[PDB]
């Protein structure tokens, strides 16, 4: 319908769960620079419905902290125009939990390659 | 205070306004990879409250989205471990708003650079 | 001066018939989806109808479907309403908003932001 | 049919931050619409696409979305703020058109 399309929330804009999951929100997991890396399985399947989902997003920049701390680009070519951001964010290397944030970021960080 | 160090909100968390501008919260606008280059004298002091900021917020990405479709890794260096991450948002440029949204997104990419 | 003005507003027995009408300035009519919204004495608003840019295709709430029928004359730039069949419960103030943009189709939307001030429709005995 | 939640009525005194919610279980893929209308008024656009202003609004309306949730947000709520408000969103399934919650009553108890 019109008005599901006009309402339609853009890619940057959706969130994922059970009922609508990593890859039908945000494609499939690849190398390609225009593709994510994040996730393994179960997170590709459950989204923010993942048991460690709040331990991951308390690493997601706000709004503000979005274009805070990000370098912001523009790309304007023939087949569209793009807002590129690239940044890091630093973690406390001395928090007690900090052992555990490295293994649970690991764990997703390009895991789609041992799927089987 | 040890309770306001103990709960004190990490850079990606904070948000900023008026009273808590982009400069406190995220520091100065520079070149360097680990520093912000996005906005405006106005938009620096501003923050939230900055008369466009729901436009500029449209395009920041959800939790989950941030971690849905940016190429996200793991930097560790002397100075500490960083989760990086790069991306892209497609403007659409058959939206009536496109026109506007890249005068205004070019407005405050690098323009920390023009600064007396 | 973006506007919308509705008539035809009245007061109707029930199995009566009403005809609104709502005529649009200051845009170009021609180009959005139009829709109306009504609103029974104390209650919420209710998406009635709405008819495409060009007048080819016509959707319908339940609550109405098979007695209202929704028209325009873009060279007239006006909407109707024929309101056929009508109950009790249709009596609401009756408003005209303009609906999404369609461009060639792709369909923009930015809220609501330009409505008629109504026409009361009272359907009793 | 597709329908959002919000609740019938919310109070308030002035100066605080009156808060209106409104659930569905499209609103993560589709986005939502506010609007103000005061007795014997036509409704007034107030927020469309989640959190963006008209022209015309005041500042202190602001929105936000998590999840299924979408909230309209007034700080330092004005007695000219006491009205019914609407959240508009449409199903995700494509087969039906706008929707309107049922509305919330702002009384600011001045």
């Known amino acids: 319908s019109s008005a599901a399309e006009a309402s339609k929330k853009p890619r940057q804009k959706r969130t994922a769960t059970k009922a609508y999951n990593v890859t039908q929100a945000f494609g499939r997991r690849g190398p390609e620079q225009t593709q994510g890396n994040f996730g393994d399985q179960e997170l590709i399947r459950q989204g923010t419905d993942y048991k460690h989902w709040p331990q991951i997003a308390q690493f997601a920049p706000s709004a503000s902290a979005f274009f805070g701390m990000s370098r912001i680009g523009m790309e304007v070519t023939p087949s569209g125009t793009w807002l590129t951001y690239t940044g890091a964010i630093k973690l406390d290397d001395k928090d007690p939990n900090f052992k555990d944030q490295v293994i649970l970021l690991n764990k997703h960080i390009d895991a789609y390659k041992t799927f089987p | 205070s040890s309770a306001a160090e103990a709960s004190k909100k990490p850079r990606q968390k904070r948000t900023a306004t008026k009273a808590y501008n982009v400069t406190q919260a995220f520091g100065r606008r520079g070149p360097e990879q680990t520093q912000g280059n996005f906005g405006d004298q106005e938009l620096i002091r501003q923050g939230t409250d900055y008369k466009h900021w729901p436009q500029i917020a449209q395009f920041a990405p959800s939790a989950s989205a941030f971690f849905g479709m940016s190429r996200i890794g793991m930097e560790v260096t002397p100075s500490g471990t960083w989760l990086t991450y790069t991306g892209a948002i497609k403007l659409d440029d058959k939206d009536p708003n496109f026109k506007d949204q890249v005068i205004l997104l070019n407005k405050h990419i690098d323009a920390y650079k023009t600064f007396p | 001066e973006v506007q919308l003005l509705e008539s035809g507003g009245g007061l109707v027995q029930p199995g009566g018939s009403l005809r609104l009408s709502c005529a649009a300035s200051?845009?170009?009519?021609?180009?959005?989806?139009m829709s109306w919204v009504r609103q029974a004495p104390g209650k919420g608003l209710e998406w009635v109808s709405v008819?495409?840019?060009?007048?080819?295709?016509?959707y319908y709430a339940d609550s109405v479907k098979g007695r209202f029928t929704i028209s325009r004359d873009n060279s007239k730039n006006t909407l109707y309403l024929q309101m056929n069949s009508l109950r009790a419960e249709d009596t609401a103030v009756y408003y005209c908003?303009?609906?999404?943009?369609?461009?060639?189709?792709?369909?923009?939307?930015?809220?609501?932001?330009?409505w008629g001030q109504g026409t009361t429709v009272t359907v009793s005995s | 049919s597709y329908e959002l939640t919000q609740p019938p009525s919310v109070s308030v005194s002035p100066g605080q931050t009156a808060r209106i919610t409104c659930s569905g279980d499209?609103?993560?893929?589709?986005?939502a619409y506010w609007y103000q209308q005061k007795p014997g008024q036509a409704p007034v656009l107030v927020i469309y696409?989640?959190?963006e202003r008209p022209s015309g609004i005041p500042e202190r309306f602001s929105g936000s979305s998590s999840g299924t949730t979408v909230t309209l947000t007034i700080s330092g709520v004005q007695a000219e703020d006491e009205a019914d408000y609407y959240c508009?969103?449409?199903?995700?399934?494509?087969?039906?058109?706008?929707?309107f919650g049922g509305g919330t009553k702002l009384t600011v108890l001045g």
């Open positions: 908003a303009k609906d999404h943009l369609e461009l060639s189709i792709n369909y923009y939307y930015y809220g609501m932001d330009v």
């Open positions: 200051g845009f170009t009519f021609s180009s959005y989806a």
């Open positions: 008819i495409y840019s060009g007048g080819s295709s016509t």
């Open positions: 499209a609103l993560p893929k589709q986005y």
């Open positions: 696409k989640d959190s």
């Open positions: 508009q969103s449409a199903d995700s399934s494509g087969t039906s058109h706008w929707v």
